[PDB]
C-alpha cells in the first residue's frame, strides 16, 4: 500500500501555488517585455529554447537517451547559434 | 527591537536595488518556497520513492544556486572580480548549466 | 620571428614527450605477446567484448549466471563501466572506417594511449600553476615516472590506466574554475567529475579533497565569490551526475564519505550570507543579529550533525576506506583484505625505487608553493600533502602520488633552472657567479639524465614481467617457458562437459571463467565472504567431510596449483593457512582451528614431523598424490619438494572420492574429478 | 521441488491432460535454480530429473513508473523548467 | 601561523613519513638485523637485503635524512642568491647547499646499491 | 622484430634528448625580452 491519494493530490495542487505567487510579485513590481523585438534571431532563439525544454517531457515519456541526445545535439546547436547572434546584438545595444 | 532592524533593512534594500535584481530576488523566493514545501512533504508522508524526492529536491537546489550565480556574475559591484566575463556570457553559462541540470534530473526523476 | 621559435620548441618537446610515453610501455609486448596480463584484467576484457557484441542496453541489464554459482552476479549493477564504454567507443570508431582491429588489441593498447594524453593534460595543468617552462618539465617527468608505468604497461588493462587521466582532467578543470570563476568551467569540471566517477572508485578522493581546499581558502580568508560560484556549481552538478551510476546509487547522499562536501556547501552558504548582512547593516545593528543568528543556526547544525550519526541513518565508513584511515582495522577484521600483499604499507625503498629524483625535488616545489601562495596553489599544496600520507598508508595508492610528485618536481627544477639561467644572461665575483651558475646547471642536467636511466632500467627489469606465463633461463641462457596454466585451462575448455562446475580458490576465478569458459563457485571480487569460507572449509576439512560440501555445491571438478616440482613459490600450499583462517572464520567452521595444523612446537611443515591433520587434509592429499615417488633432484631423495625444501612425510596413500583427471607436464596445475556417488550403497572408507 | 541449495518450493504435481504439471510463482530471490523431480518409492524405479533455470532480477525498464505518490516530485521539475523559461523571457526583455 | 611555520611542519612530517614510520608502527621490524658469522657469532645487519618491500627501523630514518638534506640544499642555495648577504657568506652558502645537494644524492644512490645487488647492473 | 634492447636504447636516447631540449628551452625563455617587459 501507498500513502493515501488524497494527500498526494493535495500536495500536487499545493505546489502550483508558488507559480501563482511568482506572477503576483512580478506583475505588481513592474516587470515588462517592452524591450522585446521581432528580430529573427530573437524569435528563433526562444523557439529553440522552448523546444529544448519541451524535449525533456518527450524523453521522460517515450524516448531513450541516445535518441534524446541525437535530437538535443541539433536543437542545442541551432539554439546556440541564434543565442550567440542575439546576445551579440544585445551587447552592442547595451554598450552603445 | 528586531522589527526595527528589519525595518531599517528593507528601507535600504527597496531603495538600493536595480529592478533586474529585484526580479531575481522574487524568482529565488519562488524557488525557495517550492523546495521548502517539497521538503515539508517528504518528511510528512515518507521517503519513498527516494529517487523522485531526491531528483525534484536537487532540481530545486540547483536552480536556486544557478540563479544566485547569475545574481552575482551580473552585479556591477563585482566587475573587478569577474574580469573578462560580460553579463551575456554569464547568461549563456547559466543556460548551459541549467540545461545539464534539467537533463540529469530527467534521468533521475524516474 | 621569436614567437615561431617558441611555438616550434614547445611543439617539438611535447611531441617527443608523447612519443616517449607511448613507446616506453611496449616492453612487455615485445618480449612475449599482445595478450592480457594478470588476473583482474580478464574480467574487464570479458565484459568489454560483451559490451562490444551485445550493445549498451543489454550490458547494463546484464545478469551473469556463469559465475558465483548458484548465486550469480549482477554485472551492470556492480561495475564501473567507463573503461568498457571507452574501449567499445574506440572499437566502433575504428571499425566504422573499416580499420577492423581485433578488440583484444584495442584493450591491450588502450593504456598507452591515455597515458600519452595524460602528458598533455599534465602540461596544461602545470602551465596554469606556473609557466610553460615548468609544464614541459612536468610532462617529461610524468612520461617516464616508473610509479605510474607500474600500473600502465601495455596489456595492463585495468581502471588505473584511465583513472589518472580523468583525475588530472578534473584537477585542470577545477583549477580553471577557481582561477576564473565561471559557470562554464564549473559545469565542465562537473562533467569531468562525472566521467571519473563512471571510471574508477577513487572518485571519493576528489569529492573529499575539493571541500578541504575550499575550507582552507575560507580559514585563510581568501574565500571570494569565484570560489562560491565554482564550488556550489561543481557540487550540485557532480552530485546529481555521480548519483546516476547504479553502483554508486544513493551513497553520495547517504554515506559519511561525502558529508564533508555537504558540510562545506552549507558553510559556504552561511558565509556568503553573513558577508552580505555585514555589508548592509551598521555595527550596532549588526552585532545583535549576528550573535543571535549564529547562536541559532550553529546550534541547529551542531544538533543535526549528531542526530545523523546517532540514528545510523547516514551509513558509517566502509571497511576499505576506514582501513585507509586506520591501518590496523583490516588485519583484524577482514582477512581477505589482509591477504593481498598489495595492501602492505610503503617502505622508503619503494619510494626511491619508484621516484628517485622526485623524492629530492618535491620539498622544493612545496617551498615554492609556500613562497608564492595563491588560491590555486593551495590546491596543489593540499593534494601533495594528502597524497604523501595516503601513499605511506598503502603502496597501491602510490599511483595517486606520482602525478603530484611530478608536477611539484617540475615546478622546483623549473625555478632552479630559470633562477640560475638569468645569471647566464651575458648575451645582452661576476666570473665566479657565472661559473657557479654553469656548474649548477650542469649538476641539474646530470640529475635529469640519471633519472632517465633509472626509470628506463626499472621499467625494463621489474614491472614488465607477465604472470599468466612463467619464465626461466637454462644453463645456456635460453628462456625456458612454462605454459601449464593455459594448457590446463584449454584442457578444461575442450575435454569436459559444458555444464561442469570447477571448484578453485578465488584467485583463479577470472582465469577459469575467461580461458576455460566453465562455471565457478568463487571469484576475486569477494562480495560473499560466506561462500569463500564455505570453499575454504571444504579445502581445509578432512577428505570424508569435504565430500559432503562438494556434493552440496554440486561440484564437478576441482583444480589445484602445485609448485613443488618447479619451485613456483605462489602455490596453494603457501595459501593453505589463509584458506584455513577463512574457512574457520564462519560460525559453521568453528571445528577448523589454525592451531591444529601447527606442530606442538608452533611451526608449519609437511615433512614427517608435520601435523597428523595437515598430512590428512584434502589439499595436502591433492597436491602430493603420487608426488612422493618423483626424483625431484639428483642430490635429493624422492619426494623432495622444491618450495618447502622438505621430504614429504606421507608418501603412499590412495584418493577415495577423487580420480586424477589431468596433471600438467610439470605438475604445475592438477585437476581432479570428484567421484560420483558409489553405485552400490557401500560407504567409502 | 524448486531448489537453489535448499528447496525453496515443494508441491504436488497435479495429474492433468495426460501429464503431471503445476503452476506456481517463482520465489523473490534470483539465482541459478533447478527444478527437481525425485519420485523415490519402494519397489518402483528411482526417477530423477533436473533442469537448470536461471532467475534474474528485474530489468531497469520494468520498474514501476508514474507512481501517483510521486506526482509532487514530477510537478516540481515541470514547475522549475517553466519558471526558468518565463524568467529567460522576462530577464532579457525587461 | 605564518606560511613558513606551516612549511616547516610539512618538512618535518615529510621526514618521518618518508622514513616509513607507518611501516614501523604496524609491522614493527627491528632497527637492524643480525646474521651468522662463519665462526658462528652474530654480525648485525643494517639493511634487509633483497627485500625491496621490507625495512628496518633505522634504515628508513637514514634514507629520509639523506632525502631531507637533498631537499634543503636547494633552499639554502636559493637563499644564497640574495645581494644583501656579505660575499664571504655567499660563497659559503654556495658551498654548503652544493655539497648537500651532491653528497646526499650520491650516498642515497650507494645505499640503494647496497639494498639491491644487481641494481642498475 | 625489434628486441627490448633496441627499445631500451631508443628510449634512453629519447629521454636524454628531451631533458637536454628542455634545458635549452629555459635559455630560450630567459633570453626573451618580451617575457620581462
Residue numbers in the entry:
A (entry chain P): 535 to 630
B (entry chain M): 4 to 113
C (entry chain I): 10 to 437, 449 to 705
D (entry chain N): 356 to 449
E (entry chain J): 28 to 148
F (entry chain K): 1 to 37
Q: What does the primary publication say about this deposited structure?
A:
The dynamic ribosome–translocon complex, which resides at the endoplasmic reticulum (ER) membrane, produces a major fraction of the human proteome. It governs the synthesis, translocation, membrane insertion, N-glycosylation, folding and disulfide-bond formation of nascent proteins. Here we use cryo-electron tomography, extensive classification and molecular modelling to capture snapshots of mRNA translation and protein maturation at the ER membrane at molecular resolution. In sum, we visualize ER-bound polysomes with their coordinated downstream machinery.
